[PDB]
Structure 1
Amino acid sequence: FVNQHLCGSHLVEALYLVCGERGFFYTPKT
């Protein structure tokens, strides 16, 4: 897997790819 800073929409796309059917939560003010 890439070793880079993942921000904004790229971070959301990375979670969609990694999590698959599980889905994910994106909560930036955490």
Structure 2
Amino acid sequence: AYRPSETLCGGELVDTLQFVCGDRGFYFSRPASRVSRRSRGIVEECCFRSCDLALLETYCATPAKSE
């Protein structure tokens, strides 16, 4: 089986987020916030480059919000 994208921009990206961050919350695209947490991530990275689960998992929503 061969697919044109090893990294399905959109599909694999948002599904992996929703998969393990369904409960935690998933948002790698942040326009703004009064917390100044407006930093988008992984979108262009994991679209064109190969990524590891660590990146997306430790990103998820906010890195220290389960604490």
TM-score (norm 2): 0.29
TM-score (norm 1): 0.44
Q: Which has the higher helix share?
A: 1
